[PDB]
Amino acid sequence: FLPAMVILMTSFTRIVVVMSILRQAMGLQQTPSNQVIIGIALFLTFFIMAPVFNQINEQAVQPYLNEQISARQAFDLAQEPMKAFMLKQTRIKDLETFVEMSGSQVTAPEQVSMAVLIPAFITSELKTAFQIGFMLFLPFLIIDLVVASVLMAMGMMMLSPMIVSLPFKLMLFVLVDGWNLILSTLAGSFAL
Amino acid sequence: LGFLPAMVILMTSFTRIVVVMSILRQAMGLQQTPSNQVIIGIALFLTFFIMAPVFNQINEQAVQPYLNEQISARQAFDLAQEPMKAFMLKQTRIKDLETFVEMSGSQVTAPEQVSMAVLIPAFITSELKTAFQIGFMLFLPFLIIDLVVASVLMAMGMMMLSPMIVSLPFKLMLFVLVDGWNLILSTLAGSFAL
Amino acid sequence: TMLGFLPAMVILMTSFTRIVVVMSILRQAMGLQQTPSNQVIIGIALFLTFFIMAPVFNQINEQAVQPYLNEQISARQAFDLAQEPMKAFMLKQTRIKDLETFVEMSGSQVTAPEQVSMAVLIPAFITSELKTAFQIGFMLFLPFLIIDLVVASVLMAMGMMMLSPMIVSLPFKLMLFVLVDGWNLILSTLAGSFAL
Amino acid sequence: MLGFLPAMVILMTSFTRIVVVMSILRQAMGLQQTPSNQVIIGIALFLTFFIMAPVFNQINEQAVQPYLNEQISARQAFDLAQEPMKAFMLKQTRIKDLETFVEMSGSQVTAPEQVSMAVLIPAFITSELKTAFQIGFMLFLPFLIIDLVVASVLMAMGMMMLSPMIVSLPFKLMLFVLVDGWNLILSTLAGSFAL
Amino acid sequence: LPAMVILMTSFTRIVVVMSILRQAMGLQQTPSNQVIIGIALFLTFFIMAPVFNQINEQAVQPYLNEQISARQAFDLAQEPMKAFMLKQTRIKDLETFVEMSGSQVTAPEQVSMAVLIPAFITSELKTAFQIGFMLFLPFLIIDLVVASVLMAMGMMMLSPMIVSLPFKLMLFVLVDGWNLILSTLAGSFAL
Amino acid sequence: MTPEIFVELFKESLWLVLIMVCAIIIPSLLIGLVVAIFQAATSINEQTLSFLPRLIITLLALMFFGHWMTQMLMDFFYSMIERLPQVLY
Amino acid sequence: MTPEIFVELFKESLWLVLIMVCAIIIPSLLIGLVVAIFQAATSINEQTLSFLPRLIITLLALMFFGHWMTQMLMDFFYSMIERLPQVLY
Amino acid sequence: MTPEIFVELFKESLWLVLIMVCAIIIPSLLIGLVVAIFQAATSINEQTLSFLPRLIITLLALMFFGHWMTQMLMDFFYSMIERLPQVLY
Amino acid sequence: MTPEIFVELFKESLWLVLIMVCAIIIPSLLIGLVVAIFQAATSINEQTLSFLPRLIITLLALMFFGHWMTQMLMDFFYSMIERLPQVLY
Amino acid sequence: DFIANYFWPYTRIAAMLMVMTVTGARFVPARVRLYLGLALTFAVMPAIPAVPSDIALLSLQGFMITFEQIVIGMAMGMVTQFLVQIFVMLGQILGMQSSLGFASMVDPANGQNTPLLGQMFMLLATLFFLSSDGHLKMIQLVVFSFKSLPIGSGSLTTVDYRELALWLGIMFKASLAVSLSGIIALLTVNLSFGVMTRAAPQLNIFSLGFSFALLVGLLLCWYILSGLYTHYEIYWQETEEQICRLIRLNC
Amino acid sequence: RSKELASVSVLVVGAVSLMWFGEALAQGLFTAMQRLFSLDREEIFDIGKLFDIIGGSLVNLLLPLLMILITLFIAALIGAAGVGGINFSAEAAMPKLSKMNPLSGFKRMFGLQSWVELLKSILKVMLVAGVAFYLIEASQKDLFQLSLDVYPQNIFHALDILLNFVLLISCSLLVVVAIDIPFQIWQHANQLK
């Protein structure tokens, strides 16, 4: 029950949702094999979390290992960079809602509890996962609609322009260099 | 061994959140795009948030007092049974609970002094009813989009074009324009009236 | 050996599989991918089991286990006394046409059915339980099939041939379940089917 | 051996035909595992006791009843246990499969009752999964007809969508009650064994 | 650790072939992993009967009538077990594993048991997959024929995994299946 | 129950499907016929003109017949709930 | 059993599918032909007019042929139950 | 809630679908009628000429009515969010 | 075995799929062509008329070609069983 | 107490096994993989340099270094998973263009997908991985890593996680390179059915729907298999050089 | 009038114009996909700036698609007016009940015209099946060569042969329209005769 938790507190939620969005956008359903999707999203999370885990290591792990602070105090200190990361990805309203529903408000978002921030973090990670997601869908939907419009103006109206549009989607996704592009917009999205 | 883990899941208000968010995932037309595992994660955190009062109360009455231990298997188990039953009874409909207490045949003068084996069956048949009502309310805008897109397509003539590969970007727009997960996951938490 | 099979035999000696089969046929009738978890179905079935077999559990604990607390006799009165309420529960719910076959296949025919062996009784009970579970599930399926066919026909009449009348009919099924009170009716005919 | 004993006591008994037939049935019905595996391996385990009542009674009379008196154990008790089991299994292995496996073993057998246990059990399982596949294949056909008739009426009316498996599930549940269903199949799975 | 003895035998090829089979013909969770492990553990008792005879009547029974060093039995039990292993491993896999262990080139039948065990399990996995994916193949024709006969007339939605299952059972019965798979898996071992 | 009881029950179900589909689609089919008569008379060959009238009428017939249709489905569900005792034995 | 027995058994099954599908769809196809002849004669090009007649007739043919169809399936299930002994050996 | 409340709610939803589909398709149907009148008058039988005008007008009507359509959907979502308390009890 | 052997084996398998699918679907496609020529000649636009002829012919072709198809699959299974020794080494 | 000394090499090996394409797949019971990765450690025990002693297993310094090797293992076998997916995608492109999986094209949601040609080309990519001994090279690459990525001396750097998460683009490029010749032939047939529907609007999805595309998509899949090992040999060099850069190994 | 000349004039031109207008439609669609795939976390975290990107890309893309569809429009219009003219007779568009009379419909439905269009129909499938299958075979070697080619230029060389295949298959219907034109011209007189 620990892996899923630490996965949620990381960048995995936005990445894997964007992957599953793109897999439907392609039209090759289930072809990149959810094991592979999860593996690639997991490799990405480690690339994005390099600064965050480096901070967690230098602030808390390194003094604790060199016997410079206790264990509970190191555990408390380790949350400071995780929360510093998570606060940047949350939105102000999504934090205010989950703060108001506890009664005990905060003067600054740094004093919020964890069990109040993580719900406010995932609601703001799904929102931006969909904000990237429909921007992924649009290039493929336009190929679909252009193929459909040309096939319709031509007559046919019965060719189901989604079997004739799968190769065009694929050729154009790989020709525009595709993945690397969107890669650099899932890495820039988690800007510290 | 496998029957018990579902019991504490059913006891808390974890089922309403999962049923609503899964009916929602089906509405949006996404194929496990919010995967099952992340839905369970979201529902687990929302449960750690809704139950934060109940868990604080059991941390003050049943967990910390278990250090001097004072008590064993007689009133320490019932001590945990009490706050759970209070919350549950706060969230069960009267029409449901009067249907199960009449089936058991054991009458109680005070609806609070109901047996647990009659309250939890009366609590889940209300969680599921509420979850279906909420999820039904939420499905409707996405149904309107699915029908408007299908009608525009069928009008322009492209009959053989699925209005699901073309209505999904619009279902993701309308879900972001309205702030989406902010609203829904607020009315879910705002449904546990305490 | 016989420790990974006990959670499969204790739940069949009791009235647990009728509820699970009925509620899973229901979940399939909603046309809605699962969303009650299998854990949820199994859990509400386990609670309805304690809710239904209470007249039998309140005798197992009263006459067999709590006397086993004074202990008074070891592994004898329990083994040969917990059968009385279980047999009296199961014999009341097997169809005669369904138990005669297992008696004639066992080779031992007795005039009084109460004297039938337990190994002959339990299969007849399972066979009479799954039959009624399928009958109940088939009864409840039909309202969720009229909606399927009406929605599919309304869509196909317009020509909207690619709509998959399974997602548009999901709100109508989700409504019809709430209008007819759903879980109360179904989990109250399930709980009231074990008339004894 | 402790990690495999529950799987070894199963294959000597009638568990393996019944579980395979009962699990092909639920794939035929379209039930998305509505009898859980722990339900089917419970039903087929109760039927195993019901079927092997004649064998388990002989084992109890010849092994456990002398075990209570401790006359001779761990050498004779095991043999008196293997004998009725060998009689039960040997009355149901096809002669062709028994001969095939004996020839594979290479040992010369002149009395079919005198085959070793280690050549009989593997010859028994291959003649048990074959019977289970024939039975569960025959019980399928009345459901494939329903699937293919519903999936054709739907397509004739014009509805490419509307998966048949939901609209053809009540018809299969009906047919499986009109034909008495579990009373026919769980009886010809019990009259299947000559014991 | 005491079950590793069974993985030294011909247990890891039968379980894999049968796990490929049940997945080849339609069945999900039909004969469960436990049933397949049982049947394969009986087929090893059948196949490894000469090896178990060699070990019993030559290293176990003299140990019961001890007249010998206790550990010496593990020297006399290792010999007839290895002789079965070494006729099943490919020479290429054994040579690569000897290079990988770092030792110089030695003649086979002198390679250590610890180098032979992994060189045996990988060579049994190659064999099990190359046998199973060939038996898989006739059950992949019926899947592709059925799903092409449906999709030709349409129906778009009738699952080819429930309409082709009777045909798979039919073919597997007409061939007799188990008398050719469980029988050619016992004549699959030359020693 | 016997086979004839379940056949009687399926006749009830197919009759519901029939009268609901008729109630919703008869108006749409009538307006399709009318607008197609218009097309044929004015010799207009525009084979997707019939869609918007038929769709408006199907939506208005779902609005008009929606209440008694949901009442008829609700009464059918209830009538198969009282029909359960004679399944029980 | 031998291969020819199981082939004979599948001919029985495909024959059932054939006669049931024919019984249900022949009336619907006939009314489709009739209403399409109407469309062609009156030069009406309204390609979803044929749906409601064909659906009404398919439902009425499921009501009319439903009893003997369920009897024919029931007799087939029974006949494959008596056919099990010759599988057994 | 009661059945009549949910029926009232579905009338709201079907009314939204109706007015949106009308707003988007009425211009396309009008231009289809106009270009088909042209075809009939000039006796031109070219049955896919109507596509590009109808598509341009559907895209321009999605551009023109897009703002108030998204506002109307947004207001509907909000109005079913304030309607949740009377579901709650 | 080498890669070219397994490629040769998959050519055998795809060839079986090809000739079976052809044997079963060529008659259905021919009758689809014939009935579609009928529709085009009589100017009948009834796009589900082709289903029952094509289905009857597919069932009759499964009845006619069923025996040699099952014999061809059986011979293929046997030929991959004799092909196992050269896998063994 | 062998396990305290050789738990980290066993962790790297057993983590590569769980994901590797052959041994770490369905069809192999997890106990077999466990007792395989446990037997491999005894064979390569000489070829493993000394682990960092003074680091206990049940300690933060131990859990860190154990996870840093589960990561290396998973990252090594996942590349062969990508290599096999390159060919599964071939099958599920030529199958979805021949309309063989078509309910999942109109319904990218629940739908109804038939992964048949995907399963067939998965069988190819596995029989090629086995026939041309890819698993032996895959194990040699791990055993070389205990001297190139030693235990307790660094792990995959951040430049490697990005280069490794770019393999989805390489998979989509390879599955298009292999099946471009099938894509062109299948589109020339789909559009020919389209010209049939244009010239004579009676030919429908019912009249001859998906019957030409299906035969031609099977014939193309048959014709592709001949020159399909020349592509596996191309992409196995990439899949092997990637791992030979992950464990630097100067290759 | 002719119903096949109008059917081939659309296909031939929908391939011909598709060639040169697609050399730029693919470029516009490429740039649109490239712009929509690249975002920088300020365009992400506020949904006011993504619709600007969407509009810009869409507008840059609308021109080649509209240029495709306007020449398809013109080809369809000129194609059907190949026989006859554009005389605007406002009387043919007024409701006349004599057009839907079943007697005249039956009479024009059967007769020699049904036989000749049945001949054309069994020819419209033989051509497209003996050309689309001839070209898929006569071009076997070059088409199998597309897999083992340099990367960026094998996709281009494949799309530059798909369009030639399409042009040939859509031009092979010229004999179908060639047997139709004199038949329709002869109908224009025998009905008067």
PDB file of N, CA and C in Angstrom, chain I residues 1-3 6-7 10-11 14-15 17-18 21-22 25-26 29 32-33 36 39-40 43-48 50-51 54, chain J residues 117 120 123-124 127-128 131-132 200-209 211-212 214-215 218-219 221-223 225-226 228-229:
ATOM      1  N   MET I   1      15.812 -24.038 -32.513  1.00  0.00           N
ATOM      2  CA  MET I   1      15.561 -23.658 -33.897  1.00  0.00           C
ATOM      3  C   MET I   1      16.068 -22.257 -34.219  1.00  0.00           C
ATOM      4  N   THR I   2      16.165 -21.963 -35.512  1.00  0.00           N
ATOM      5  CA  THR I   2      16.631 -20.676 -35.993  1.00  0.00           C
ATOM      6  C   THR I   2      15.447 -19.768 -36.309  1.00  0.00           C
ATOM      7  N   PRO I   3      15.683 -18.470 -36.515  1.00  0.00           N
ATOM      8  CA  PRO I   3      14.570 -17.579 -36.875  1.00  0.00           C
ATOM      9  C   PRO I   3      13.862 -17.947 -38.163  1.00  0.00           C
ATOM     10  N   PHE I   6      11.141 -20.621 -37.670  1.00  0.00           N
ATOM     11  CA  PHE I   6       9.910 -20.149 -37.050  1.00  0.00           C
ATOM     12  C   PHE I   6       9.139 -19.224 -37.973  1.00  0.00           C
ATOM     13  N   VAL I   7       9.834 -18.462 -38.809  1.00  0.00           N
ATOM     14  CA  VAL I   7       9.149 -17.688 -39.836  1.00  0.00           C
ATOM     15  C   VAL I   7       8.457 -18.608 -40.831  1.00  0.00           C
ATOM     16  N   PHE I  10       5.299 -19.793 -39.158  1.00  0.00           N
ATOM     17  CA  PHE I  10       4.236 -18.796 -39.193  1.00  0.00           C
ATOM     18  C   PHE I  10       3.666 -18.581 -40.581  1.00  0.00           C
ATOM     19  N   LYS I  11       4.459 -18.751 -41.630  1.00  0.00           N
ATOM     20  CA  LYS I  11       3.861 -18.739 -42.954  1.00  0.00           C
ATOM     21  C   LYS I  11       2.866 -19.875 -43.116  1.00  0.00           C
ATOM     22  N   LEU I  14      -0.335 -18.658 -41.113  1.00  0.00           N
ATOM     23  CA  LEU I  14      -1.065 -17.625 -41.827  1.00  0.00           C
ATOM     24  C   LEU I  14      -1.673 -18.155 -43.112  1.00  0.00           C
ATOM     25  N   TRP I  15      -1.041 -19.136 -43.753  1.00  0.00           N
ATOM     26  CA  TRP I  15      -1.651 -19.740 -44.924  1.00  0.00           C
ATOM     27  C   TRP I  15      -2.900 -20.525 -44.566  1.00  0.00           C
ATOM     28  N   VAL I  17      -4.901 -19.833 -41.971  1.00  0.00           N
ATOM     29  CA  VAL I  17      -5.912 -18.817 -41.709  1.00  0.00           C
ATOM     30  C   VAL I  17      -6.457 -18.279 -43.016  1.00  0.00           C
ATOM     31  N   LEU I  18      -5.582 -18.032 -43.986  1.00  0.00           N
ATOM     32  CA  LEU I  18      -6.004 -17.446 -45.247  1.00  0.00           C
ATOM     33  C   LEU I  18      -6.948 -18.361 -46.003  1.00  0.00           C
ATOM     34  N   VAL I  21     -10.398 -18.751 -44.032  1.00  0.00           N
ATOM     35  CA  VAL I  21     -11.196 -17.543 -44.155  1.00  0.00           C
ATOM     36  C   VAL I  21     -11.704 -17.379 -45.576  1.00  0.00           C
ATOM     37  N   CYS I  22     -10.868 -17.660 -46.572  1.00  0.00           N
ATOM     38  CA  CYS I  22     -11.331 -17.596 -47.951  1.00  0.00           C
ATOM     39  C   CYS I  22     -12.451 -18.586 -48.209  1.00  0.00           C
ATOM     40  N   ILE I  25     -15.660 -17.266 -46.514  1.00  0.00           N
ATOM     41  CA  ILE I  25     -16.146 -15.910 -46.735  1.00  0.00           C
ATOM     42  C   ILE I  25     -16.313 -15.598 -48.218  1.00  0.00           C
ATOM     43  N   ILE I  26     -15.592 -16.299 -49.091  1.00  0.00           N
ATOM     44  CA  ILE I  26     -15.789 -16.105 -50.529  1.00  0.00           C
ATOM     45  C   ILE I  26     -17.230 -16.341 -50.941  1.00  0.00           C
ATOM     46  N   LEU I  29     -19.191 -13.332 -49.587  1.00  0.00           N
ATOM     47  CA  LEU I  29     -18.885 -12.124 -50.346  1.00  0.00           C
ATOM     48  C   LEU I  29     -19.485 -12.161 -51.741  1.00  0.00           C
ATOM     49  N   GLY I  32     -23.111 -11.389 -51.294  1.00  0.00           N
ATOM     50  CA  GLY I  32     -23.210  -9.967 -51.018  1.00  0.00           C
ATOM     51  C   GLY I  32     -23.081  -9.124 -52.268  1.00  0.00           C
ATOM     52  N   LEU I  33     -22.107  -9.442 -53.119  1.00  0.00           N
ATOM     53  CA  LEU I  33     -21.990  -8.765 -54.406  1.00  0.00           C
ATOM     54  C   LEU I  33     -23.241  -8.934 -55.251  1.00  0.00           C
ATOM     55  N   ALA I  36     -26.130  -6.962 -53.804  1.00  0.00           N
ATOM     56  CA  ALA I  36     -25.854  -5.539 -53.941  1.00  0.00           C
ATOM     57  C   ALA I  36     -26.002  -5.076 -55.382  1.00  0.00           C
ATOM     58  N   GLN I  39     -29.660  -4.586 -55.657  1.00  0.00           N
ATOM     59  CA  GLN I  39     -30.045  -3.311 -55.072  1.00  0.00           C
ATOM     60  C   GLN I  39     -29.699  -2.144 -55.986  1.00  0.00           C
ATOM     61  N   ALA I  40     -28.475  -2.106 -56.506  1.00  0.00           N
ATOM     62  CA  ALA I  40     -28.057  -1.024 -57.389  1.00  0.00           C
ATOM     63  C   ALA I  40     -28.871  -0.966 -58.671  1.00  0.00           C
ATOM     64  N   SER I  43     -32.306   0.129 -57.935  1.00  0.00           N
ATOM     65  CA  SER I  43     -32.197   1.376 -57.185  1.00  0.00           C
ATOM     66  C   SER I  43     -32.859   1.276 -55.814  1.00  0.00           C
ATOM     67  N   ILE I  44     -32.624   0.163 -55.123  1.00  0.00           N
ATOM     68  CA  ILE I  44     -33.141  -0.068 -53.779  1.00  0.00           C
ATOM     69  C   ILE I  44     -32.025   0.251 -52.798  1.00  0.00           C
ATOM     70  N   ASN I  45     -32.290   1.147 -51.858  1.00  0.00           N
ATOM     71  CA  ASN I  45     -31.273   1.591 -50.908  1.00  0.00           C
ATOM     72  C   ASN I  45     -31.674   1.142 -49.507  1.00  0.00           C
ATOM     73  N   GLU I  46     -31.471  -0.145 -49.231  1.00  0.00           N
ATOM     74  CA  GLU I  46     -31.925  -0.752 -47.990  1.00  0.00           C
ATOM     75  C   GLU I  46     -30.774  -1.551 -47.399  1.00  0.00           C
ATOM     76  N   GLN I  47     -29.966  -0.899 -46.573  1.00  0.00           N
ATOM     77  CA  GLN I  47     -28.574  -1.293 -46.403  1.00  0.00           C
ATOM     78  C   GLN I  47     -28.391  -2.469 -45.454  1.00  0.00           C
ATOM     79  N   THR I  48     -29.477  -3.094 -45.019  1.00  0.00           N
ATOM     80  CA  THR I  48     -29.373  -4.315 -44.233  1.00  0.00           C
ATOM     81  C   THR I  48     -30.127  -5.467 -44.870  1.00  0.00           C
ATOM     82  N   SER I  50     -28.720  -7.221 -47.232  1.00  0.00           N
ATOM     83  CA  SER I  50     -27.676  -8.175 -47.560  1.00  0.00           C
ATOM     84  C   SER I  50     -27.355  -9.115 -46.415  1.00  0.00           C
ATOM     85  N   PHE I  51     -27.984  -8.959 -45.255  1.00  0.00           N
ATOM     86  CA  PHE I  51     -27.492  -9.698 -44.102  1.00  0.00           C
ATOM     87  C   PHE I  51     -27.950 -11.144 -44.123  1.00  0.00           C
ATOM     88  N   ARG I  54     -26.215 -13.406 -46.809  1.00  0.00           N
ATOM     89  CA  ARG I  54     -24.835 -13.628 -46.414  1.00  0.00           C
ATOM     90  C   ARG I  54     -24.714 -14.537 -45.206  1.00  0.00           C
TER      91      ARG I  54
ATOM     92  N   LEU J 117      -3.607 -10.536 -33.722  1.00  0.00           N
ATOM     93  CA  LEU J 117      -2.332 -10.325 -34.385  1.00  0.00           C
ATOM     94  C   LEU J 117      -1.303  -9.733 -33.438  1.00  0.00           C
ATOM     95  N   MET J 120       0.016 -12.808 -31.883  1.00  0.00           N
ATOM     96  CA  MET J 120       0.849 -13.529 -32.838  1.00  0.00           C
ATOM     97  C   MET J 120       2.230 -12.906 -32.977  1.00  0.00           C
ATOM     98  N   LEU J 123       4.302 -13.562 -30.031  1.00  0.00           N
ATOM     99  CA  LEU J 123       4.929 -14.876 -30.127  1.00  0.00           C
ATOM    100  C   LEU J 123       6.168 -14.837 -31.009  1.00  0.00           C
ATOM    101  N   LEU J 124       6.095 -14.133 -32.138  1.00  0.00           N
ATOM    102  CA  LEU J 124       7.297 -13.867 -32.933  1.00  0.00           C
ATOM    103  C   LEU J 124       8.407 -13.226 -32.119  1.00  0.00           C
ATOM    104  N   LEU J 127       9.911 -15.666 -29.756  1.00  0.00           N
ATOM    105  CA  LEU J 127      10.657 -16.755 -30.367  1.00  0.00           C
ATOM    106  C   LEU J 127      11.909 -16.278 -31.074  1.00  0.00           C
ATOM    107  N   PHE J 128      11.965 -15.013 -31.460  1.00  0.00           N
ATOM    108  CA  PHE J 128      13.186 -14.391 -31.939  1.00  0.00           C
ATOM    109  C   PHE J 128      14.111 -14.033 -30.802  1.00  0.00           C
ATOM    110  N   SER J 131      15.260 -17.729 -29.896  1.00  0.00           N
ATOM    111  CA  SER J 131      16.025 -18.415 -30.929  1.00  0.00           C
ATOM    112  C   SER J 131      17.404 -17.809 -31.109  1.00  0.00           C
ATOM    113  N   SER J 132      17.483 -16.546 -31.494  1.00  0.00           N
ATOM    114  CA  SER J 132      18.724 -15.793 -31.408  1.00  0.00           C
ATOM    115  C   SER J 132      18.901 -15.460 -29.938  1.00  0.00           C
ATOM    116  N   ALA J 200     -21.106   2.934 -56.540  1.00  0.00           N
ATOM    117  CA  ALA J 200     -22.369   2.242 -56.307  1.00  0.00           C
ATOM    118  C   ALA J 200     -22.670   2.280 -54.819  1.00  0.00           C
ATOM    119  N   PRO J 201     -23.514   3.213 -54.374  1.00  0.00           N
ATOM    120  CA  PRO J 201     -23.768   3.367 -52.933  1.00  0.00           C
ATOM    121  C   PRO J 201     -24.494   2.201 -52.290  1.00  0.00           C
ATOM    122  N   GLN J 202     -24.740   1.108 -53.013  1.00  0.00           N
ATOM    123  CA  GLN J 202     -25.416  -0.036 -52.413  1.00  0.00           C
ATOM    124  C   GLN J 202     -24.430  -0.912 -51.657  1.00  0.00           C
ATOM    125  N   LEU J 203     -23.216  -1.058 -52.187  1.00  0.00           N
ATOM    126  CA  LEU J 203     -22.150  -1.725 -51.458  1.00  0.00           C
ATOM    127  C   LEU J 203     -21.888  -0.985 -50.155  1.00  0.00           C
ATOM    128  N   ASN J 204     -22.026  -1.698 -49.049  1.00  0.00           N
ATOM    129  CA  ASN J 204     -22.173  -1.070 -47.750  1.00  0.00           C
ATOM    130  C   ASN J 204     -21.171  -1.687 -46.791  1.00  0.00           C
ATOM    131  N   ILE J 205     -21.319  -1.352 -45.511  1.00  0.00           N
ATOM    132  CA  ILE J 205     -20.670  -2.125 -44.460  1.00  0.00           C
ATOM    133  C   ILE J 205     -21.388  -3.455 -44.281  1.00  0.00           C
ATOM    134  N   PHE J 206     -22.599  -3.579 -44.831  1.00  0.00           N
ATOM    135  CA  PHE J 206     -23.321  -4.846 -44.749  1.00  0.00           C
ATOM    136  C   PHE J 206     -23.071  -5.709 -45.977  1.00  0.00           C
ATOM    137  N   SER J 207     -23.036  -5.095 -47.158  1.00  0.00           N
ATOM    138  CA  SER J 207     -22.928  -5.853 -48.399  1.00  0.00           C
ATOM    139  C   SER J 207     -21.575  -6.539 -48.515  1.00  0.00           C
ATOM    140  N   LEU J 208     -20.493  -5.780 -48.417  1.00  0.00           N
ATOM    141  CA  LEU J 208     -19.158  -6.353 -48.402  1.00  0.00           C
ATOM    142  C   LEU J 208     -18.299  -5.654 -47.368  1.00  0.00           C
ATOM    143  N   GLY J 209     -18.864  -5.433 -46.185  1.00  0.00           N
ATOM    144  CA  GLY J 209     -18.174  -4.676 -45.164  1.00  0.00           C
ATOM    145  C   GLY J 209     -17.030  -5.458 -44.564  1.00  0.00           C
ATOM    146  N   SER J 211     -14.669  -7.248 -45.699  1.00  0.00           N
ATOM    147  CA  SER J 211     -14.347  -8.552 -46.253  1.00  0.00           C
ATOM    148  C   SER J 211     -13.167  -8.531 -47.201  1.00  0.00           C
ATOM    149  N   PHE J 212     -12.927  -7.424 -47.898  1.00  0.00           N
ATOM    150  CA  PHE J 212     -11.713  -7.293 -48.691  1.00  0.00           C
ATOM    151  C   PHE J 212     -10.542  -6.876 -47.823  1.00  0.00           C
ATOM    152  N   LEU J 214     -10.065  -7.495 -44.861  1.00  0.00           N
ATOM    153  CA  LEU J 214      -9.698  -8.598 -43.991  1.00  0.00           C
ATOM    154  C   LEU J 214      -8.803  -9.622 -44.666  1.00  0.00           C
ATOM    155  N   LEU J 215      -9.193 -10.104 -45.844  1.00  0.00           N
ATOM    156  CA  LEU J 215      -8.334 -10.992 -46.612  1.00  0.00           C
ATOM    157  C   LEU J 215      -7.012 -10.338 -46.964  1.00  0.00           C
ATOM    158  N   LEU J 218      -4.774 -10.096 -43.914  1.00  0.00           N
ATOM    159  CA  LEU J 218      -4.151 -11.374 -43.593  1.00  0.00           C
ATOM    160  C   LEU J 218      -3.037 -11.724 -44.563  1.00  0.00           C
ATOM    161  N   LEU J 219      -3.240 -11.482 -45.852  1.00  0.00           N
ATOM    162  CA  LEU J 219      -2.184 -11.736 -46.820  1.00  0.00           C
ATOM    163  C   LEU J 219      -0.976 -10.839 -46.598  1.00  0.00           C
ATOM    164  N   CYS J 221      -0.045  -9.536 -43.635  1.00  0.00           N
ATOM    165  CA  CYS J 221       0.611 -10.073 -42.452  1.00  0.00           C
ATOM    166  C   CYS J 221       1.398 -11.323 -42.780  1.00  0.00           C
ATOM    167  N   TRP J 222       0.925 -12.114 -43.740  1.00  0.00           N
ATOM    168  CA  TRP J 222       1.675 -13.293 -44.158  1.00  0.00           C
ATOM    169  C   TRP J 222       2.929 -12.902 -44.924  1.00  0.00           C
ATOM    170  N   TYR J 223       2.831 -11.886 -45.775  1.00  0.00           N
ATOM    171  CA  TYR J 223       3.964 -11.460 -46.585  1.00  0.00           C
ATOM    172  C   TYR J 223       5.001 -10.688 -45.793  1.00  0.00           C
ATOM    173  N   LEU J 225       6.076 -11.470 -42.755  1.00  0.00           N
ATOM    174  CA  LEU J 225       6.858 -12.323 -41.867  1.00  0.00           C
ATOM    175  C   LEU J 225       8.179 -12.746 -42.484  1.00  0.00           C
ATOM    176  N   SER J 226       8.278 -12.746 -43.810  1.00  0.00           N
ATOM    177  CA  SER J 226       9.519 -13.180 -44.434  1.00  0.00           C
ATOM    178  C   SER J 226      10.672 -12.266 -44.050  1.00  0.00           C
ATOM    179  N   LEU J 228      10.934 -10.160 -41.606  1.00  0.00           N
ATOM    180  CA  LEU J 228      10.682  -9.619 -40.281  1.00  0.00           C
ATOM    181  C   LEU J 228      11.799  -9.911 -39.297  1.00  0.00           C
ATOM    182  N   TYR J 229      12.684 -10.851 -39.599  1.00  0.00           N
ATOM    183  CA  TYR J 229      13.855 -11.023 -38.758  1.00  0.00           C
ATOM    184  C   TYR J 229      14.927  -9.989 -39.047  1.00  0.00           C
TER     185      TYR J 229
END
